[PDB]
Amino acid sequence: QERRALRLGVNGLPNSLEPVNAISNVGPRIVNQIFDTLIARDFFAKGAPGNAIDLVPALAESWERIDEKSVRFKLRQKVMFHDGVELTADDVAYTFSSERLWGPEAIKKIPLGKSYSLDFDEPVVEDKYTVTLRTKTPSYLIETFVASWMSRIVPKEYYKKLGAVDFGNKPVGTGPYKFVEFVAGDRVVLEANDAYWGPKPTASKITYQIVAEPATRVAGLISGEYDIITTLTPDDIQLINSYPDLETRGTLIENFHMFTFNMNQEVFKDKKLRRALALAVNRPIMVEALWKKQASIPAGFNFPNYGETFDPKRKAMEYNVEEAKRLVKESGYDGTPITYHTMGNYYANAMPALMMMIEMWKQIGVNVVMKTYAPGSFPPDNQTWMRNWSNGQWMTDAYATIVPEFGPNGQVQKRWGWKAPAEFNELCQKVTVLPNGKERFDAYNRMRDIFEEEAPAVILYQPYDVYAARKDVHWKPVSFEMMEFRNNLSFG
Ligand SMILES: C[C@H](OP(=O)(O)O[C@@H]1[C@@H](O)[C@H](O)[C@@H](CO)O[C@H]1O)C(O)O
Ligand code: NA
């Protein structure tokens, strides 16, 4: 009869379906279905196992870089939003506007819009199907930005009429799946958009059902309640793979798990204790015990997806228990227990990783205690000391995420109080405008050195993202924190 409905058991849900505000480990797998971008990354180009870097036309049928500051897009014609309104350059201009995204006025609507954006100038609408995106200063990052999760295309009139909050609860996009319902902290339901411009949706419906406990998620797959489950650990591989009708599907993703600090707190204003905690983390033993060797430990804030700004000659991050003990003493730390906030196992292995780290920190003379918090119940900033986090490396360049998250205009310095050395912020400003070359390459290596010296966050590893699925549900994971169903979902 009708197509099969897809049932997903997920680790968590975003609090909003507004595509920029949905940026997280849990939002993109949903908003990738509701929306489209001008340029799309094709993870399966030339038979790649879901990790190809190839950029292909999407809402823009073609594009041309004009100069060091601008890129002109030719829009695909007769593309319709879910409410029937035709996609125009007006919708694109609005998506990348000062008003909605990067200007001072957008900070209330999209709190991280300005900090995550390029140094944009107002878009230029040439005609109904022609729009130029430009920057005030040189930027060779326009293309990678436009293909990213910052750039899902929103409908101007409908978005303006509802406002960013109401739009977030009733999204309208051009994507293969349209909005049905959103029960905050419970479920999101989408249905097939059969008016879709690209590959027709193969599922009649998609339900993202929150299953916070991974053991309950695994039981749900074994019982036949879910078709695909997310955010498992390599420790679940043996059991699931013992069921002949189920299997695990995993891949290393372009993201790093970390722990970070509220540097507005007295104990973390200075770098000494941040550094002591960083120097005591035995990453290889965590990777062996919890990840069955599947996770990858980077040589600093440095990843292969950065391409020309990836440094393959970089030394491993320091591990020095004896130096850590000496820093604990010099910091003046008195033995008072320091809290570490985690949203249960929102991050695969969050609590087992923390338990191991608590033990490593006991050995250097620092008492760390776990504090759990329910989905969407993140405690006030001044109630937090240490906390876990992750960063999706969302550009084919080193700019992201060191500059958008840890730069002078970023939330780590502004909200979380990192007093970054003046040199670090000078380098951030330089890498933003410089073209690729020796000067830019060396500036990112100096920024990586300062990042390790300062420890505003401590990089753990790139997780091996593990899903489990029914063998009769054909779907391949991609090397990013999202799920792709276009030409990548079939049943039987
Ligand atoms: C607690 C959640 O954070 P999560 O680690 O899931 O997502 C990060 C995101 O915060 C960050 O802006 C981007 C780019 O650095 O990477 C995402 O992985 C929050 O965003 O809902
Ligand atoms: Na499809």
Side-chain angles (χ1 to χ4, degrees), residues 214-285:
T216 309
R217 222 151 55 232
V218 173
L221 184 74
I222 297 162
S223 73
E225 275 177 65
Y226 305 113
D227 295 305
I228 308 164
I229 61 172
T230 79
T231 325
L232 306 174
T233 64
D235 307 88
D236 304 316
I237 296 175
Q238 295 273 52
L239 174 95
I240 287 146
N241 289 298
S242 84
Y243 287 87
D245 305 293
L246 310 178
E247 70 185 9
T248 58
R249 301 183 191 149
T251 184
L252 196 71
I253 63 162
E254 299 146 18
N255 170 276
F256 71 89
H257 281 195
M258 79 183 95
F259 64 88
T260 189
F261 314 88
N262 179 0
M263 291 159 280
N264 301 113
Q265 305 286 16
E266 274 294 312
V267 86
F268 299 131
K269 282 189 176 182
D270 185 72
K271 67 170 176 165
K272 281 179 220 77
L273 200 65
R274 299 193 305 245
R275 271 281 286 182
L277 295 160
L279 289 168
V281 181
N282 192 330
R283 294 159 186 101
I285 204 75

Coordinates of all heavy atoms in Angstrom, one line a residue, residues 214-285:
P214 N 20.4 5.0 26.8 CA 20.8 4.2 25.7 C 20.4 2.7 25.8 O 20.1 2.1 24.8 CB 22.3 4.4 25.6 CG 22.8 4.9 26.8 CD 21.6 5.6 27.5
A215 N 20.3 2.1 27.1 CA 19.9 0.7 27.3 C 18.4 0.5 26.8 O 18.1 -0.5 26.2 CB 20.1 0.3 28.7
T216 N 17.6 1.5 27.1 CA 16.2 1.6 26.7 C 16.1 1.7 25.2 O 15.2 1.0 24.6 CB 15.4 2.7 27.5 OG1 15.7 2.5 28.9 CG2 13.9 2.7 27.2
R217 N 17.0 2.5 24.6 CA 17.0 2.7 23.1 C 17.3 1.3 22.4 O 16.6 1.0 21.5 CB 18.1 3.8 22.8 CG 17.6 4.7 21.7 CD 18.2 6.1 21.8 NE 19.7 6.1 21.8 CZ 20.4 6.6 22.8 NH1 19.8 7.3 23.8 NH2 21.7 6.6 22.7
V218 N 18.4 0.6 22.9 CA 18.8 -0.7 22.5 C 17.6 -1.8 22.6 O 17.3 -2.5 21.7 CB 20.1 -1.3 23.1 CG1 20.4 -2.7 22.7 CG2 21.3 -0.4 22.7
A219 N 16.9 -1.8 23.8 CA 15.7 -2.6 24.0 C 14.6 -2.4 22.9 O 14.0 -3.3 22.4 CB 15.2 -2.5 25.4
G220 N 14.4 -1.1 22.6 CA 13.4 -0.6 21.6 C 13.7 -1.1 20.2 O 12.8 -1.5 19.5
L221 N 15.0 -1.2 19.8 CA 15.4 -1.8 18.5 C 15.2 -3.3 18.5 O 14.6 -3.8 17.6 CB 16.9 -1.4 18.2 CG 17.3 -1.9 16.8 CD1 16.7 -1.1 15.6 CD2 18.8 -1.9 16.7
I222 N 15.6 -4.0 19.6 CA 15.4 -5.4 19.7 C 14.0 -5.8 19.7 O 13.6 -6.8 19.1 CB 16.2 -6.0 21.0 CG1 17.7 -5.7 20.9 CG2 15.9 -7.5 21.3 CD1 18.5 -5.8 22.2
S223 N 13.1 -5.0 20.4 CA 11.6 -5.3 20.4 C 10.8 -5.0 19.1 O 9.7 -5.4 19.0 CB 11.0 -4.6 21.6 OG 10.9 -3.2 21.4
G224 N 11.4 -4.2 18.2 CA 10.7 -3.8 17.0 C 10.0 -2.5 17.0 O 9.3 -2.2 16.1
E225 N 10.3 -1.7 18.1 CA 9.7 -0.4 18.3 C 10.3 0.7 17.4 O 9.6 1.7 17.0 CB 9.7 0.1 19.7 CG 8.6 -0.5 20.6 CD 8.6 -0.1 22.0 OE1 8.6 1.1 22.4 OE2 8.8 -1.1 22.8
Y226 N 11.6 0.6 17.1 CA 12.4 1.5 16.3 C 13.0 0.9 15.1 O 13.4 -0.3 15.1 CB 13.4 2.3 17.1 CG 12.8 3.0 18.3 CD1 13.1 2.6 19.6 CD2 11.8 4.0 18.2 CE1 12.5 3.1 20.7 CE2 11.2 4.5 19.3 CZ 11.5 4.1 20.6 OH 10.9 4.7 21.7
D227 N 13.2 1.7 14.0 CA 13.9 1.2 12.8 C 15.4 1.5 12.8 O 16.2 0.7 12.4 CB 13.2 1.9 11.5 CG 11.8 1.5 11.3 OD1 11.5 0.3 11.2 OD2 10.9 2.4 11.3
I228 N 15.7 2.7 13.4 CA 17.1 3.1 13.6 C 17.2 3.8 14.9 O 16.3 4.6 15.3 CB 17.6 4.1 12.4 CG1 17.3 3.5 11.0 CG2 19.1 4.5 12.6 CD1 17.4 4.6 9.8
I229 N 18.3 3.6 15.6 CA 18.6 4.2 16.9 C 19.9 4.9 16.9 O 20.8 4.4 16.2 CB 18.4 3.3 18.2 CG1 19.4 2.0 18.1 CG2 16.9 2.8 18.4 CD1 19.4 1.2 19.4
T230 N 20.1 6.0 17.6 CA 21.3 6.8 17.5 C 22.1 6.7 18.8 O 21.7 6.2 19.8 CB 20.9 8.3 17.2 OG1 20.5 8.9 18.4 CG2 19.9 8.4 16.1
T231 N 23.3 7.3 18.7 CA 24.2 7.6 19.8 C 24.6 6.5 20.7 O 24.4 6.6 22.0 CB 23.6 8.9 20.5 OG1 23.0 9.7 19.6 CG2 24.7 9.7 21.4
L232 N 25.0 5.3 20.1 CA 25.4 4.2 20.9 C 26.9 4.2 21.2 O 27.6 5.1 20.7 CB 24.9 2.9 20.2 CG 23.4 2.8 19.8 CD1 23.2 1.5 19.1 CD2 22.5 2.8 21.1
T233 N 27.4 3.2 21.9 CA 28.8 3.2 22.2 C 29.4 1.9 21.5 O 28.6 0.9 21.4 CB 29.2 3.2 23.7 OG1 28.6 2.0 24.3 CG2 28.7 4.5 24.4
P234 N 30.7 1.8 21.2 CA 31.2 0.5 20.6 C 31.0 -0.7 21.5 O 31.1 -1.8 21.0 CB 32.7 0.9 20.3 CG 32.7 2.3 20.1 CD 31.7 2.8 21.2
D235 N 30.6 -0.5 22.7 CA 30.3 -1.6 23.7 C 29.0 -2.2 23.4 O 28.7 -3.3 24.0 CB 30.4 -1.0 25.1 CG 31.7 -0.3 25.4 OD1 31.8 0.9 25.2 OD2 32.7 -0.9 25.8
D236 N 28.1 -1.7 22.5 CA 26.8 -2.2 22.2 C 26.9 -3.0 20.9 O 25.9 -3.7 20.5 CB 25.8 -1.1 22.0 CG 25.6 -0.2 23.2 OD1 25.5 -0.7 24.4 OD2 25.5 1.0 23.0
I237 N 28.0 -2.9 20.1 CA 28.2 -3.5 18.8 C 28.0 -5.1 18.9 O 27.2 -5.6 18.1 CB 29.6 -3.1 18.2 CG1 29.6 -1.6 17.9 CG2 30.0 -4.0 17.0 CD1 31.0 -1.1 17.4
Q238 N 28.7 -5.8 19.8 CA 28.6 -7.3 19.9 C 27.2 -7.8 20.1 O 26.8 -8.7 19.4 CB 29.6 -7.8 21.1 CG 31.1 -7.6 20.8 CD 31.7 -8.7 20.0 OE1 31.2 -9.1 18.9 NE2 32.8 -9.2 20.5
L239 N 26.4 -7.2 21.1 CA 25.1 -7.6 21.4 C 24.1 -7.4 20.2 O 23.4 -8.3 19.8 CB 24.5 -7.0 22.6 CG 23.0 -7.2 22.9 CD1 22.8 -8.4 23.9 CD2 22.3 -6.0 23.4
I240 N 24.1 -6.2 19.6 CA 23.2 -5.9 18.5 C 23.5 -6.7 17.3 O 22.6 -7.4 16.8 CB 23.1 -4.3 18.2 CG1 22.4 -3.6 19.3 CG2 22.5 -4.1 16.8 CD1 22.9 -2.2 19.6
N241 N 24.8 -6.9 17.0 CA 25.2 -7.7 15.8 C 25.0 -9.2 16.0 O 25.0 -9.9 15.0 CB 26.7 -7.3 15.4 CG 26.7 -6.0 14.8 OD1 26.1 -5.7 13.7 ND2 27.4 -5.0 15.4
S242 N 24.6 -9.6 17.3 CA 24.3 -11.0 17.5 C 22.8 -11.3 17.0 O 22.5 -12.5 16.8 CB 24.4 -11.4 19.0 OG 23.3 -11.1 19.8
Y243 N 22.0 -10.3 16.8 CA 20.6 -10.4 16.2 C 20.7 -10.4 14.7 O 21.2 -9.4 14.2 CB 19.7 -9.3 16.8 CG 19.3 -9.5 18.2 CD1 20.1 -9.0 19.2 CD2 18.2 -10.2 18.6 CE1 19.8 -9.2 20.6 CE2 17.9 -10.4 19.9 CZ 18.7 -9.9 20.9 OH 18.3 -10.1 22.2
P244 N 20.4 -11.5 14.0 CA 20.5 -11.6 12.6 C 19.8 -10.6 11.7 O 20.1 -10.4 10.6 CB 20.1 -13.0 12.2 CG 19.3 -13.5 13.4 CD 19.9 -12.8 14.6
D245 N 18.7 -10.0 12.3 CA 17.9 -9.0 11.6 C 18.3 -7.5 11.9 O 17.6 -6.6 11.5 CB 16.4 -9.2 11.8 CG 16.0 -10.7 11.5 OD1 16.0 -11.0 10.3 OD2 15.6 -11.4 12.4
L246 N 19.3 -7.3 12.8 CA 19.8 -6.0 13.2 C 21.3 -5.9 12.9 O 22.0 -6.9 12.8 CB 19.5 -5.8 14.7 CG 18.1 -6.0 15.3 CD1 18.1 -5.8 16.8 CD2 17.1 -5.2 14.6
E247 N 21.8 -4.6 12.9 CA 23.2 -4.4 12.7 C 23.6 -3.0 13.1 O 22.7 -2.1 13.2 CB 23.7 -4.6 11.2 CG 23.2 -3.6 10.2 CD 23.5 -3.8 8.7 OE1 24.0 -4.9 8.4 OE2 23.3 -2.9 7.9
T248 N 24.9 -2.8 13.4 CA 25.3 -1.5 13.7 C 25.9 -0.9 12.5 O 26.4 -1.6 11.6 CB 26.3 -1.5 14.9 OG1 27.5 -2.3 14.6 CG2 25.7 -1.9 16.2
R249 N 25.8 0.5 12.4 CA 26.4 1.2 11.3 C 27.0 2.4 12.0 O 26.4 3.2 12.7 CB 25.3 1.7 10.3 CG 24.5 0.5 9.7 CD 23.5 0.9 8.7 NE 22.7 -0.2 8.3 CZ 21.4 -0.1 8.0 NH1 20.8 1.0 7.9 NH2 20.7 -1.2 7.7
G250 N 28.4 2.5 11.9 CA 29.1 3.5 12.5 C 30.2 4.2 11.6 O 30.5 3.6 10.6
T251 N 30.6 5.4 12.1 CA 31.6 6.1 11.3 C 32.2 7.2 12.3 O 31.6 7.7 13.1 CB 31.0 6.8 10.1 OG1 32.1 7.4 9.4 CG2 29.9 7.8 10.3
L252 N 33.5 7.5 12.0 CA 34.2 8.6 12.7 C 33.5 9.9 12.1 O 33.4 10.0 10.9 CB 35.7 8.6 12.5 CG 36.5 9.4 13.4 CD1 36.6 8.8 14.8 CD2 37.9 9.6 12.9
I253 N 33.1 10.8 13.0 CA 32.4 12.0 12.5 C 33.3 13.3 12.7 O 34.2 13.2 13.6 CB 31.0 12.2 13.0 CG1 31.0 12.4 14.6 CG2 30.0 11.1 12.6 CD1 29.7 13.1 15.1
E254 N 33.1 14.3 11.9 CA 33.8 15.6 12.0 C 33.3 16.4 13.2 O 32.6 17.4 13.0 CB 33.8 16.3 10.6 CG 34.4 15.5 9.5 CD 33.8 15.6 8.2 OE1 33.1 16.6 8.0 OE2 34.0 14.8 7.3
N255 N 33.7 16.0 14.4 CA 33.2 16.6 15.6 C 34.2 16.1 16.7 O 34.8 15.0 16.5 CB 31.8 16.0 16.0 CG 31.3 16.4 17.4 OD1 31.6 15.7 18.4 ND2 30.5 17.4 17.5
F256 N 34.4 16.9 17.7 CA 35.2 16.5 18.9 C 34.4 16.7 20.2 O 33.8 17.7 20.4 CB 36.6 17.1 18.9 CG 36.7 18.6 19.3 CD1 36.8 19.0 20.6 CD2 36.7 19.6 18.3 CE1 36.9 20.4 20.9 CE2 36.9 20.9 18.6 CZ 36.9 21.3 19.9
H257 N 34.5 15.7 21.1 CA 34.0 15.7 22.4 C 35.0 16.4 23.3 O 36.2 16.3 23.0 CB 33.8 14.3 23.0 CG 32.5 13.6 22.5 ND1 32.0 12.5 23.1 CD2 31.7 14.0 21.4 CE1 30.9 12.2 22.4 NE2 30.7 13.0 21.4
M258 N 34.6 17.2 24.2 CA 35.5 17.9 25.1 C 34.8 18.1 26.5 O 33.6 17.9 26.7 CB 35.8 19.3 24.5 CG 34.7 20.4 24.7 SD 34.9 22.0 23.9 CE 34.0 21.7 22.4
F259 N 35.6 18.7 27.4 CA 35.1 19.3 28.6 C 35.6 20.7 28.6 O 36.6 21.0 27.9 CB 35.4 18.5 29.9 CG 36.9 18.4 30.3 CD1 37.5 19.4 31.1 CD2 37.6 17.3 30.0 CE1 38.8 19.2 31.5 CE2 38.9 17.1 30.4 CZ 39.5 18.1 31.1
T260 N 34.8 21.6 29.2 CA 35.1 23.1 29.3 C 34.8 23.6 30.7 O 34.3 22.9 31.5 CB 34.5 23.8 28.1 OG1 35.0 25.2 28.0 CG2 33.0 23.8 28.1
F261 N 35.1 24.9 30.9 CA 35.0 25.5 32.2 C 34.2 26.9 32.1 O 34.2 27.6 31.1 CB 36.4 25.9 32.7 CG 37.4 24.8 32.6 CD1 38.2 24.6 31.4 CD2 37.7 23.9 33.7 CE1 39.2 23.6 31.4 CE2 38.7 22.9 33.6 CZ 39.4 22.8 32.4
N262 N 33.6 27.2 33.3 CA 33.0 28.4 33.5 C 34.1 29.3 34.1 O 34.4 29.2 35.3 CB 31.8 28.4 34.4 CG 31.1 29.7 34.6 OD1 31.6 30.8 34.1 ND2 30.1 29.8 35.4
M263 N 34.8 30.1 33.2 CA 35.9 30.9 33.6 C 35.5 32.2 34.3 O 36.4 33.0 34.7 CB 36.9 31.0 32.4 CG 37.6 29.7 32.1 SD 38.2 29.6 30.4 CE 36.7 29.3 29.5
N264 N 34.2 32.3 34.6 CA 33.7 33.4 35.5 C 33.8 33.0 36.9 O 33.8 33.8 37.8 CB 32.2 33.8 35.1 CG 32.0 34.2 33.7 OD1 31.3 33.5 32.9 ND2 32.5 35.4 33.3
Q265 N 34.0 31.6 37.2 CA 34.2 31.1 38.5 C 35.6 31.3 39.0 O 36.5 31.1 38.2 CB 33.8 29.6 38.6 CG 32.4 29.3 38.1 CD 31.3 29.7 39.0 OE1 31.4 30.4 40.0 NE2 30.1 29.1 38.8
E266 N 35.8 31.8 40.2 CA 37.1 32.1 40.8 C 38.2 31.0 40.5 O 39.3 31.4 40.1 CB 37.0 32.3 42.3 CG 36.7 33.8 42.7 CD 37.7 34.8 42.3 OE1 38.9 34.6 42.7 OE2 37.4 35.8 41.7
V267 N 37.9 29.7 40.8 CA 38.8 28.6 40.6 C 39.3 28.4 39.2 O 40.4 27.8 39.0 CB 38.2 27.3 41.2 CG1 37.3 26.6 40.2 CG2 39.2 26.4 41.8
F268 N 38.6 28.9 38.2 CA 39.0 28.8 36.8 C 39.3 30.1 36.0 O 39.4 30.1 34.8 CB 37.9 28.0 36.0 CG 37.7 26.5 36.4 CD1 36.4 26.0 36.7 CD2 38.8 25.7 36.6 CE1 36.3 24.7 37.1 CE2 38.6 24.4 37.1 CZ 37.4 23.9 37.3
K269 N 39.4 31.2 36.8 CA 39.7 32.5 36.2 C 41.2 32.5 35.6 O 41.4 32.9 34.5 CB 39.6 33.7 37.2 CG 38.2 34.1 37.5 CD 38.2 35.4 38.3 CE 36.7 35.9 38.5 NZ 36.7 37.2 39.3
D270 N 42.1 31.8 36.3 CA 43.5 31.6 35.9 C 43.6 30.2 35.2 O 42.8 29.3 35.3 CB 44.4 31.6 37.2 CG 45.8 31.5 36.9 OD1 46.4 32.5 36.4 OD2 46.4 30.4 37.1
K271 N 44.6 30.1 34.3 CA 44.9 28.9 33.5 C 45.5 27.7 34.3 O 45.5 26.6 33.7 CB 45.8 29.3 32.3 CG 47.2 29.7 32.6 CD 48.0 29.8 31.3 CE 49.4 30.3 31.6 NZ 50.4 30.0 30.5
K272 N 46.1 27.9 35.5 CA 46.8 26.9 36.2 C 46.1 25.6 36.5 O 46.6 24.5 36.2 CB 47.5 27.4 37.5 CG 48.8 28.2 37.3 CD 49.3 28.7 38.6 CE 49.9 30.1 38.4 NZ 48.8 31.2 38.3
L273 N 44.8 25.7 37.1 CA 44.0 24.5 37.4 C 43.4 23.9 36.1 O 43.3 22.7 36.0 CB 43.0 24.7 38.5 CG 42.4 23.5 39.2 CD1 43.5 22.7 40.0 CD2 41.3 23.8 40.1
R274 N 43.1 24.8 35.1 CA 42.5 24.3 33.8 C 43.5 23.4 33.2 O 43.2 22.3 32.7 CB 42.1 25.5 32.9 CG 41.1 26.4 33.4 CD 40.5 27.3 32.3 NE 41.5 28.1 31.6 CZ 41.6 29.4 31.6 NH1 40.8 30.2 32.4 NH2 42.6 30.0 30.9
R275 N 44.8 23.8 33.1 CA 45.9 23.1 32.6 C 46.3 21.8 33.4 O 46.6 20.8 32.8 CB 47.2 24.0 32.7 CG 47.3 24.9 31.4 CD 47.9 24.0 30.3 NE 49.4 23.8 30.5 CZ 50.1 23.1 29.7 NH1 49.6 22.6 28.6 NH2 51.4 23.0 30.0
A276 N 46.2 21.9 34.7 CA 46.4 20.7 35.6 C 45.4 19.6 35.2 O 45.8 18.5 35.1 CB 46.2 21.1 37.1
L277 N 44.1 19.9 35.1 CA 43.1 19.0 34.7 C 43.3 18.4 33.3 O 43.2 17.2 33.2 CB 41.7 19.6 34.8 CG 41.2 20.0 36.3 CD1 40.1 20.9 36.3 CD2 40.9 18.7 37.1
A278 N 43.8 19.2 32.3 CA 44.1 18.9 31.0 C 45.3 17.9 30.9 O 45.2 16.9 30.3 CB 44.4 20.1 30.1
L279 N 46.3 18.2 31.7 CA 47.6 17.4 31.7 C 47.4 16.0 32.3 O 48.2 15.1 32.1 CB 48.7 18.2 32.4 CG 49.3 19.3 31.6 CD1 50.2 20.1 32.5 CD2 50.1 18.8 30.4
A280 N 46.3 15.8 33.1 CA 46.1 14.5 33.8 C 45.1 13.6 33.0 O 45.0 12.5 33.5 CB 45.5 14.8 35.2
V281 N 44.6 14.0 31.9 CA 43.6 13.2 31.1 C 44.5 12.2 30.3 O 45.2 12.6 29.4 CB 42.6 14.0 30.2 CG1 41.7 13.1 29.5 CG2 41.8 15.0 31.1
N282 N 44.3 10.9 30.6 CA 44.9 9.8 29.8 C 44.0 9.4 28.7 O 43.2 8.5 28.8 CB 45.4 8.7 30.7 CG 46.3 7.7 30.0 OD1 46.2 7.4 28.8 ND2 47.1 7.0 30.8
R283 N 44.0 10.1 27.6 CA 43.1 9.9 26.4 C 43.2 8.5 25.8 O 42.2 7.9 25.7 CB 43.2 10.9 25.3 CG 42.8 12.3 25.7 CD 43.4 13.3 24.8 NE 43.2 14.7 25.3 CZ 44.0 15.5 25.9 NH1 45.2 15.0 26.3 NH2 43.7 16.7 26.3
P284 N 44.5 7.9 25.6 CA 44.5 6.6 25.0 C 43.8 5.5 25.8 O 43.2 4.6 25.3 CB 46.0 6.3 24.8 CG 46.6 7.7 24.7 CD 45.8 8.5 25.7
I285 N 43.9 5.6 27.2 CA 43.3 4.6 28.0 C 41.7 4.7 28.0 O 41.1 3.6 28.0 CB 43.8 4.6 29.5 CG1 43.6 3.2 30.1 CG2 43.3 5.7 30.4 CD1 44.5 2.1 29.6

